[PDB]
Amino acid sequence: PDSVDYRKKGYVTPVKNQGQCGSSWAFSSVGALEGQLKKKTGKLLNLSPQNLVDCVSENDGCGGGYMTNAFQYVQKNRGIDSEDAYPYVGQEESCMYNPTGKAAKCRGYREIPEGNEKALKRAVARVGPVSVAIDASLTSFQFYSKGVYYDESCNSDNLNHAVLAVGYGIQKGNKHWIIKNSWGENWGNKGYILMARNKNNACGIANLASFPKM
Numbered sequence: 001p002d003s004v005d006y007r008k009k010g011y012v013t014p015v016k017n018q019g020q021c022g023s024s025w026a027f028s029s030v031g032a033l034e035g036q037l038k039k040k041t042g043k044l045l046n047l048s049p050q051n052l053v054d055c056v057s058e059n060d061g062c063g064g065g066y067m068t069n070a071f072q073y074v075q076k077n078r079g080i081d082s083e084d085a086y087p088y089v090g091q092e093e094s095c096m097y098n099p100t101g102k103a104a105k106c107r108g109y110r111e112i113p114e115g116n117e118k119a120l121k122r123a124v125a126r127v128g129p130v131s132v133a134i135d136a137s138l139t140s141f142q143f144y145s146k147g148v149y150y151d152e153s154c155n156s157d158n159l160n161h162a163v164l165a166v167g168y169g170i171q172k173g174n175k176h177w178i179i180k181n182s183w184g185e186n187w188g189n190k191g192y193i194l195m196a197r198n199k200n201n202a203c204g205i206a207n208l209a210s211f212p213k214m
């Protein structure tokens with residue numbers, strides 16, 4: 001069985017909802033950090049995307065951002081707050097980080113070689129959940145309900161949405177990535193989508209992948 005589902009292993013927190021704020025980069029980043037918190041310490045908790053929205057000046061808050069900028073921030077800031085200590089409000093505010101609420105740390109990051117789905121698979125297997133960016137603009141993506149998603153019109157050069165690869169596997173003969181979104185449990189299959197794997201880097205799944213070192 002060349003498959004892994006980190007949701008079964010306790011590496012994945014409940015699905016969140018970014019609301020009316022283009023902060024999927026922040027949810028993708030905290031998801032990867034949460035997975036490494038479980039792996040390194042044996043337990044996890046919800047980390048603060050609002051911490052990243054307000055304090056990662058290299059990104060654009062609700063206007064977009066990159067996950068490696070977030071990992072670099074957590075490293076140089078010497079921590080990121082828990083969700084409970086720094087709760088999500090769906091809009092950018094002044095940076096209110098407090099070391100008293102520190103719940104995770106970061107020693108750097110690694111970017112997966114661009115477009116290499118085999119390297120992405122090895123990273124998911126050997127690290128844990130990996131932050132990724134995809135083209136999520138298609139209507140077919142947005143109304144996804146079940147099965148393995150593949151749409152030929154997906155633009156690997158148009159990465160517009162950050163998500164989290166929490167595993168991989170195969171379903172009815174179709175290889176897939178298990179993808180955690182940030183559009184609520186209401187979206188997709190309880191917040192998740194299975195995206196085609198080894199189909200010429202569909203939707204750019206392996207073009208902007210990274211994970212934090214802890």
Ligand SMILES: [Cl-]
Nearest residue numbers: 002121175198
């Ligand atoms: Cl394979």
